[PDB]
Amino acid sequence: VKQDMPPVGGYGPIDYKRNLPRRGLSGYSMFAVGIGALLFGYWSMMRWNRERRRLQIEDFEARIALMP
Amino acid sequence: TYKYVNLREPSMDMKSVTDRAAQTLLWTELIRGLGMTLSYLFREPATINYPFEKGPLSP
Numbered sequence: 001v002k003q004d005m006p007p008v009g010g011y012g013p014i015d016y017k018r019n020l021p022r023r024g025l026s027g028y029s030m031f032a033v034g035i036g037a038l039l040f041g042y043w044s045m046m047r048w049n050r051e052r053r054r055l056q057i058e059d060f061e062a063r064i065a066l067m068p
Numbered sequence: 069t070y071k072y073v074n075l076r077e078p079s080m081d082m083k084s085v086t087d088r089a090a091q092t093l094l095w096t097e098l099i100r101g102l103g104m105t106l107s108y109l110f111r112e113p114a115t116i117n118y119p120f121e122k123g124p125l126s127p
Contacts, residue, residue: 027087027091027094031086
């Protein structure tokens with residue numbers, strides 16, 4: 001009998017092809033994401049700065065009334 | 069049979085040029101490279117603790 005190493009009935013298929021997911025996000029919408037986060041931060045920043053100006057004028061009134 | 073590489077052209081459509089502009093100004097493909105390297109981070113490394121585990125061989 002003969003006992004070499006053949007392919008056992010023909011092997012299954014072998015992949016070789018390239019693949020890229022191209023993800024993605026449709027980058028103009030990603031610019032919209034960035035500009036939205038930017039303007040979100042500016043809105044909250046504006047609110048906090050004006051409330052802190054209010055409190056800083058209160059500390060001004062403290063130093064004014066305490067002074068004489 | 070010959071299958072040459074690097075023969076495309078930049079499509080002057082608005083979609084393609086804004087995708088390449090997002091690629092430039094938004095560091096997207098660099099984040100893709102970081103994603104690939106962390107995808108190999110959370111694997112289990114194929115090392116062998118040597119003086120206890122000797123390597124494989126042939127007869």
